[PDB]
Structures are given as structure tokens and as C-alpha cells.
Design a protein around this nucleic acid. Structure first.
Lengths: 316, 131, 316, 303, 133, 131
DNA sequence: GGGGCGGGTTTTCCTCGA
């Protein structure tokens, strides 16, 4: 597994939107419970949904797969990830619906040999014989660090007008600035492996042949998420992003690094990784740390400089 | 006394809205989630009212509705409006800010009242022009 | 026995679901009675069922048992815990149904030597000669702390759309944020011990041989629950979890630590443990405390740093 | 793709105005988070919107296209970039509205042959059969450098608000998608003319950046003409996605060069070139072309 | 009673907002309210919809002879014409209604039930006249 | 006019029962001992009818039984039902609630009529399917 | 000068024994 925690600093930002009231475009906000010296409090803070990150990751994976010759679905060739949920998608792609439960595996393989997106991000088919496949990449909401007693985030509204020589043209846009943090998980040991239980079906040999390329493409696709290519309204509200801290852990056993809420979350996660490897009878545990804010790290830890080096090391 | 304070804040917001012809400050007040947003609107609306006072376009008066009631006359863009009631005192602003520090709900209550005052006055003014 | 009380802080959460209305997915809510300075009040607060926690614990136990070579049932090998309730499960596994009451013990042993899950989590068989086995791990609903006059929890709805080039695709998802608390109990002195009264039956020697490994696996399985690997909708709504306070008590006599509702629930439970050991004529009483919020603890109490150290200490 | 980061030094300018209160004109301000030894601070700083920069760029593009011979729309001939959004604009221009999805592509092509601005800058049509075309040029807000523990920016009143600061901003432009339909469907007549005019359109789009890089933008230039001066500029031309580091830290050329090299290594790139203009005597590195002015940069990009 | 008159005027406001917006969502929210927050939010949102209809001259006060003149509100929506008989609430009616809600949220359910009855009767009559023509 | 109001309320209850395939609202109406229970059912049945209207599964029509009579067509689970008569007006609901405030007996009368309408229609529909 | 449009969810299971 590959589990990562990343901290970003973004200023003058609007990438996620919600329903609008009047001539005002609103930014997504969520409640958070924060601990202060006086107890516990509830606050409302701007956030960014994880679905945008998933869409960006899937689009980058589509581009990489098309460049490298891996098969891509007809509907997924266009950036519309309906996958194989409805019958119209099946009719367009040309895959017969499953007949009974025993045929479900076959259907899964037929879906899995045509689109890498269905293999990596999972899919669902609802009907007489429903078929499920959980996504192999897991993300979450982007929340600013809940450090100290003051939340380092702010939101405001801005005024804009449209010019016209014959007045008969005024709108408002919400803009936020914060220090975001988010974590991600990706298990590469289950890529190109069927999930529905059953008997062997012809076509698994091709999946075994393409497993290495699929894993390499899935690992490469994380560069877009780690770089900052996500969100909307980038034509006129391009944000200013800067990486501050990054922790990546590669293990053969389940593990979850500490959230990037406290200033000391690298030493703790390294110690927890060592103890978890000791207690769970593991055989592989590696850590990579990128630091640009001069906080405590620890000892015996590999230190990188950019994200491309991390991607190359993960691929190798 | 809390309801009287909220009512006087609502009168201030309604006067500022009718004078500026803009709902933007009332929208900001009713959507406030922090004391910062509420306090910023309380300043900006009073700054608009101050300009109307200096121009003699906003004035306190009494009106017979058979006893005399306190009112505020507002002249905007050749329209005349009359808001019935008092404007808030400095003590009302301070006590209202203390109520907001306990519960931002009171900003929504004042905003809802202010919009009701402004809507009723705008409807009556449009009806008299149509007649 | 091992009894624990744990406090968690979770933000932007949706792990448990209930019936849906229209295009809205709802979060489980329950009534709670809370005491304020004005008396007693009834409120509706989001909660999380304990069955999800039990499923996560059993899945982790299955994984550990398969890794360590302990036997695992055929149906339980797949993550479907029907156990041995119906006749179809018995036919699939290949175990004859009990004939009379006197044979029941034999049947229990046959169930107990094939699946560790049936041994630890208990099971039920209904028929002419019903067989019962109570679970050795006890959990409860996850409720936020009822401290003070204001409940530190919030719930809201979020808006989502599905993209399509040919409109003919809109849904809502409930998201909550709270400070959860929950308690658990596990009696390891009855693991790998038959519960039905009767005479000795061949096959108990193997159970006695495997008792130590079964106890070790059961203790190890608590790491998933104490870490935060439970609940659904983790693909796109991965939550942010952070441990705040944990109390664990190991005793030779029945005991129940105080619920994590008041700020001072460690000193009270330690004093109660001492007095209970004094009054009940016990011979073993140990306590472990993990604190990260700077609340009162007491004196003469072992203080840990992470959860892996606690697991290692419990195993040793 | 052509990406770039630029640093400017502006003294006594009022280029973007917002809602006025009383007899005072207000300069646009935005919050920013700054890191200091004692912690974090939230500061209000003047800023300039990107829509003004887009307007200036599109006006320069219109002028250049008219001077060259490329087609320009009726309304767009006047400096009013409403484009093909409402039915009135279509009626004035004389283009039939789309009937269904199948015809959408055709409609796009038609618009794409009547206005170069609608092609480079994108457009949107709302109705029974909505149509879209994302802009090929991307800009952002202009913010002063957030370097050190002090923000080099001042704002004062004179009533009119006047500011001074050391601004920075980044831009992106994808020239590989110009003169290319963005909708999926069967080929339709007229694409041959687009293929013919692709080169001229790309050249004009590249030339249009000189206005922005020179300092021809903003309002209130009649009486408050600013004094601008270029300090540092980095430009990168590649064949794969890339973005240079923001011009906040004193050393952002070396980092972006190293990242460009490693990105070419990882993403199986074929072309990657960088141009640097330096006048403040900061670290640069090695193996980089050094120019003297923006005109040489434009000429090299065109070549 | 004056309480019934206030509830009836609130029901007229909800019915006008429903007929103009063609959406039951605000009436559903009002009739299911368990707090003063939900009621007050609907009272704002419905008046904001009515304000747009007033500014567009699609909502207007009138009198209709049903042989005395009764106060009414004309609503034009999507080429349909509706007439709601009665007054819209005053600012004092909204304030007195909010005080009634602070005592018992039952009054929001009563107003919602009346509003849906007004809207249903008007929609049924409008569909019948279109079928005859 | 009281009997006409009760008959129109009974038609509404019968339409809601035939569309929902649930007697629960009619049971609640006929067992009501307070205005609260009656009013709650009057809302819930109209909310069910509103969904059937929006789905075009409930529609007003005329039927020749040799003059045209007003009727309501109901489509539920592939069954087609026709209730003869009008649905209540807002005034009928208000006048019926006033009758309930005097005597809750009228809810029992309307419930008994509604169940009679629904039973006769269900019996006729089952007989035609058996033939 | 007080915006416009397209979307308001699809399966699967409704208790077993003394």
C-alpha cells in the first residue's frame, strides 16, 4: 500500500462551487469541531470536495493510458465518467448484460479488459445481477489544519461588472485563502485482479500480462494530484499553490499516517510505522519525507527535494 | 429589551437598504457566520446612513399613524420612504454585538426583520405610483 | 478481562447510512437525553451503529488468522459472516446437524475447530436442538460526548452532480462532524473454551493447544478498531480521525470504566478500580492511559504514547 | 504549452477600482496568510483582477487580427466581449441557433469562423443545446511577493486610493489546441479553412502577449499613469503539462529549471526549453539562455 | 381569530410563492419544520421569490368580484395565470407568526396545510379549463 | 353542503388509498379523536396525491356513466382505478376542519365513505382480472 | 442595471426456531 499526507498553502482560491443565491456564487463550507484551551468549539470553514480530486486523477490516468497504448473505454475517452452504470452506456460500448450470478465474473472481466478507469476507480452495475467493484484509490475532503486556537483560513466576496455601451451586468464571486491538508491511500497489490469470487474465465492471461503497465500508470497518475492540477474556475481565478510538507509510506500491511493537523506529525507516524511493522509481522516498510518549513523530522529518514523524485522512486 | 435592540438594528439595516437601493449589506448580515461579518456590516450601513444624514436625505421625524410615532424619512433617487421606529444607540450596537458573540442567530433575525420592513415600504411606494 | 474507553474527533464524516428519501442519502440519528442547568432535554444526534465496528473487527481477525495459519471457515473466508445459522451454510461447510441435546456439545466443537470467527464472535443455530454461543467481544453505539449544555456535533447536506454531454444526475449526501466516544469489552479467559455443558468430547486437546494463538490473534485484532479502519463510503468521503483520550483496564474480576462523557473520567475510573479490587478480593488490576488533550490523569499511572505500544503490552 | 512567471515593480498606481463609498474611490484588496517566526498573520493587501488582463489581451488580439486580415466579429469589432452568449448577439451576428446535440459541432465551427476572439478566448452558449469552449489562455490575480516577514506594499489616500508594490503573476497558454474544435462528432465542412488559418491564428495569439508583458493594462491611466519596470521573468515551452514556481521566493528560477528537467525525464517529454530575463542579480544556474528584453523573447517564441 | 387571520395570510404567501416558482420545496420545508430556524428561512426565501415576481410585474395585488370586491393576488407563471384570493402578510403578521412559532411550531404545519390546499384547488381549476378549451 | 364537503373529503381519502395501496391514512382518519390527527391525515393524503399528480398517475377526467360526470383517474402498480366525483377545494378543507372542531364524528363519516369507495373499486378491478 | 439553461436517482433483501 501507498499512504500519503500532504500540506498545501493556497491564496485567493475558488475551485469548488455550490448552489448560488441571487448574483452571488458561494464557496463550499463545512462545520468542524476544534479544541481550544477553553474546551471544544464548532466553526464553519471553507472546504473542497474529494470528487474533484478523483475526477482530476481519473482524467490524468485517461491521458497516460491513451499515450501508453492501454485500452480506454469509448465513453471514458471523452471526460465523462459515467462508467458502466446504466444500460445506455452498455449499449454504446457493446457489452451484454449479465444473465445470472454465475456469469457476473465474466461481465466483470469484459468491463476490465476495455477500460483501465473501471479497473482502478471501480464501478457499479445495478440490475437483476448487480456487480460491484470498490475503487483502488481513496481520497477525502480537503480541510485546513486545525492547529492552535485560530483557524488559518478566510473567506470573502468580490465585486465584478460587465461592460456594455447600452445599459438596460453585476455579479459577486466568493474567494478564500487557507492552508489546506489532505491524505490519500492507494493499494497497488489489487490492481488488475478480479474481485468477484468464482471460477477461472478466459481472458485473465491478458490481465496478468498488462498488470505491470496498469500499476505503473496508476502510480504515475498521482503526479497531477501532488502537483496541483485540480478544481475549476482556473481560467480567471488561477490559484497560487506551494507545497510545504509531504509524507509517503509504502507498506505490505494496512497503515494510516497521522493527519497533517499538528506541527509534529512526521516523527509520530515514523515511530508508529516502526512499531506497527514490529507488531503485525510485516516484511516491508519504507518512508519518504519532503520538508520545506523546517519542522522536526527525526533520524534515519530519506529526504527528497521535489515530487518527481518521489514518483520515480515509487515506480522503481 | 433584546427584541427592542434587534428591532432597532433591523430599522438601521432597512434605512441603509432603502437609501442605497442595495440589498448587499442585508444579505451579508443575514448570512453572517462570524462576529467579523456582522460588525463589518454594522459599520458599512452606519457609514451609508452618515452620508444620507450629511446630505439631509436621511432625517429623524415623528409621524401620526392618532399618537406621534418616531420615524426616519429617507429620500433616494426621487423616491420618499418612511421607516417607523428608532435607530439603534451606541449601547444597542454594543449589546447587539454581545448577543452576536453568544449566538449569530440574532443577525439572521435582524436581517429577516429589515428585509420585511424594506419590502413592505417598496410595495406601498410602487402601488401609489401605479394609482 | 480487557475494558476500554476511547474518544475520537472526526470531521466531514459519513460512514453509516440508513434508508434514503428521494435523491438524499441520510445519516443515522438517535435521540439522547442530556442534562443542562435548566433540567433535562431530548435532542436528536447523529450516531454510528456498533455492527459496523463488529464487522471490521471480524474482517481483521479473518485476515490475521489466515496470515498466521489458523483455520478459517469456507463461507467466512469471503467477507460474509452468516456463520452457521441456516442449513445452507452447514451444507456448504459440510457439518452434520445435531441430533438431540446430548450431541449439541459435539456440534459446537465441530464448529469451533473450523472457524475462529465462530469461536470469538459467537454463533447461533436454530432447529430441533438449538445451539447458542455468546460473543466474546462486546461493543456499543458510537455517541458524541454529552458534555456541558451544547452538543459538539453537526450535520448538513451536500449537493453533487454527474456530468453528461446529453442531458435528459443530481444527488445529495449527508455529512456530519462530531467528537465521538465509545467503550468496548473483551474477556480473553473464555476464548477457545466450550460453553455448552456436557461430557468430554474428543478434539478438545487441539483447542487447548491452539488457545494461546487464538487469544493472541483476538488481542491483535483490536488494532483495527483502535486505529480507525471501519465504516463505509471511504472511497470518496475518507474521514479525518485523531485520537484524543484512551483508557484500558486489565482485571481478573468484572469491571466497567466510566463513559467518556465528562472531562474527568480517568481519575474516577482508577479510584473505582482500586476500590473494586479491594472489595471484590481480586488479584490483578492494571491500567493504561493515553492522553493527548492535557486533562487530569492522576498518580502512579503508566502513560503510553501510541496504540501499538498498548497492543504489545497487552500481548506480553 | 507556453507557461511563464513575471515580477513587476509598480509605484503610485490605481489600476483596478471597486465599489465606492461616499466620495472615496476604493482600491481592490484581498486577504493573505503570511508565515513569520512568531506564527501566522492575516493581512489585507491590494490586488489586481485577472479579468482586466484578459480584456487587455483580447483587445490587443483584436487589433492585431484586424491589422493582419483574420476575421473578427461584428460586436467584437467594438471593444465589447459579450461574445455569443445571448440570442441578441446571435441575431446581430446572424447565426442560427443550434437545433440539437448532433448539430452542436457545426454551430461551434460557424462561430469559430466568424471571430478569432471566440476561438482563442473560448465562449459559452446557454439554452436548449448549451455549447462550451474553454479559454486557451489562463491568467490569475496579481499579488505582491509574500517574501520574508514584511510585505513590500503600501496603500494610501489622496479622494482617491493610490498604491505601490512589487507585483508578481503567472500565465499559461496552450498553442497546440488553437484552431481546433473541442466538440466530438463527425467532420463538417469548413474545417479546411481552419487548418489553413491555424498558423496565422497561433502567430497572432503569441504576439498578443507583448501587451501584457509590456505593461499595457488597467484603468485610470489618463491621470494616474504608472511607472512600471521589469525585474525577473521566466518562460517555459514544453509539450507536456508544466507550471513554473510562483515568483515569491528569491530563488525560483533554479528550482523551476530543475523541476522542468526532472519532469521531462519522468513524463517522456520530447521538447523542453526555458528563457530567463534577469535584472535584479539573483541566482539563475547553468545551461539557460539569457535575453535582454521581451522583444527577443517574443521573436524566439515565434521562431 | 387574529391568530387564524395571520396563519391564513402566511398560507396565501406560501401559495403565491409555490404557484409562481412551480416548486413545492419551500412549502414542504415549512410543513416539516421542527425549529424556528427552518420556518424563518422559508419565510425569507418565499418572500424573495415573491419580490422577483413583483419586480417582473408577474405578481400584482388586485381586487376581484366573486358581488363585493375581494382582495386578491394575480400570479403569472410559465404562461399560466393564477389568482389567489386574500391578503399577503404584513411585517407585523410575520413577526406575530414568528412569536407563535417560538411558542408552538404546530402553526407552521397549519399554514403549510392551508397553502397546499389553496395551490391544489387553483391548479385543478386551471387544468380543467385547459381541457375544456 | 356539509354532505357534499364530506363526500369530496371521502373522494380525496379514496384516491390517496388507491394510489398508495395503504389503508393507514384512512385508519388514522376514522379513529381520530382530535383535530390534530385529522389535519395531519389531510396533509399526508394531499402530499401523496401531489406526487401522483406530478408523476401524471393521478389526473382529473370526465366519464360517461349518458351525461359526463367528473372523475379522478388513478394509476397504481399497473392497476387503473377511476373514482367518480370531485376532489375537495381549499375552502372544503377549511370548512371541513371547522366541522371537525365542532364534532370529530365527521372524520369517521368521511372515513367510512372513503373505505366504501375504495372497496367497491378494488372488488370490480379483481373481478375483471379473473374474467 | 436586480441573469439565463440541463439535471430532483436507479437493484436487492421485507425473518428463521422452541
Amino acid at each position: 500500500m501507498i499512504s500519503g499526507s500532504v500540506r498545501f498553502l493556497v491564496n485567493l482560491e475558488s475551485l469548488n462551487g455550490v448552489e448560488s443565491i441571487g448574483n452571488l456564487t458561494k464557496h463550499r463550507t463545512a462545520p468542524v469541531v476544534l479544541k481550544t484551551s477553553t474546551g471544544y468549539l464548532v466553526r464553519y470553514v471553507p472546504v473542497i470536495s474529494g470528487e474533484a480530486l478523483a475526477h482530476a486523477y481519473q482524467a490524468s490516468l485517461v491521458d497516460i493510458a491513451k499515450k501508453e497504448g492501454l485500452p480506454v473505454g469509448s465513453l471514458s475517452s471523452q471526460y465523462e465518467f459515467i462508467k458502466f452504470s446504466t444500460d445506455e452506456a452498455l449499449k454504446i460500448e457493446g457489452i451484454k448484460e449479465p444473465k445470472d450470478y454465475n456469469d457476473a465474473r465474466r461481465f466483470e472481466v469484459e468491463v476490465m479488459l476495455k477500460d483501465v478507469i473501471a479497473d482502478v476507480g471501480g464501478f457499479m452495475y445495478a440490475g437483476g445481477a448487480p456487480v460491484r467493484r470498490t475503487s483502488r484509490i481513496k481520497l477525502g475532503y480537503m480541510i485546513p489544519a486545525l492547529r492552535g486556537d485560530e483557524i488559518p483560513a478566510q473567506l470573502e466576496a468580490q465585486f465584478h461588472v460587465r461592460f456594455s455601451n447600452k445599459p438596460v451586468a453585476i455579479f459577486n464571486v466568493e474567494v478564500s485563502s487557507a492552508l489546506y491538508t489532505f491524505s490519500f491511500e492507494l493499494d497497488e497489490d489489487l490492481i488488475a485482479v478480479p474481485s468477484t469470487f468464482g471460477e477461472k474465465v478466459k481472458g485473465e492471461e491478458e490481465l496478468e500480462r498488462q498488470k505491470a503497465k496498469r500499476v505503473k500508470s496508476a502510480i504515475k497518475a498521482l503526479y497531477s494530484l501532488l502537483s496541483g492540477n485540480f478544481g475549476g474556475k482556473r481560467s480567471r481565478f488561477l490559484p497560487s499553490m506551494k507545497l510545504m510538507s509531504l509524507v509517503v509510506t509504502k507498506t505490505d500491511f494496512p497503515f494510516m499516517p497521522e493527519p497533517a493537523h499538528d506541527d509534529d506529525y512526521i516523527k509520530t507516524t515514523i515511530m508508529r510505522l516502526g512499531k506497527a511493522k514490529g507488531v503485525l509481522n510485516g516484511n516491508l516498510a519504507k518512508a519518504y519525507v519532503i520538508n520545506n518549513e523546517g519542522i522536526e523530522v527525526g533520524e534515519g529518514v530519506t529526504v527528497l527535494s521535489t515530487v518527481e523524485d518521489l514518483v520515480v522512486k515509487l515506480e522503481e | 429589551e433584546k427584541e427592542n435592540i434587534i428591532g432597532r438594528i433591523a430599522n438601521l439595516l432597512a434605512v441603509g437598504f432603502l437609501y442605497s437601493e442595495s440589498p448587499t449589506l442585508v444579505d451579508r448580515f443575514a448570512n453572517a457566520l462570524s462576529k467579523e461579518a456582522v460588525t463589518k456590516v454594522l459599520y458599512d450601513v452606519q457609514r451609508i446612513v452618515q452620508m444620507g444624514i450629511d446630505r439631509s436625505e436621511i432625517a429623524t421625524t415623528t409621524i401620526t399613524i392618532g399618537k406621534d410615532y418616531p420615524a426616519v424619512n429617507v429620500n433616494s433617487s426621487g423616491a420618499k420612504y418612511t421607516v417607523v421606529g428608532y435607530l439603534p444607540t451606541s449601547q444597542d450596537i454594543e449589546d447587539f454585538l454581545r448577543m452576536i458573540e453568544e449566538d449569530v442567530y440574532y443577525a439572521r433575525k435582524a436581517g429577516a426583520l429589515a428585509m420585511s420592513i424594506a419590502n413592505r415600504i417598496k410595495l406601498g411606494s410602487k402601488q401609489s405610483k401605479s394609482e
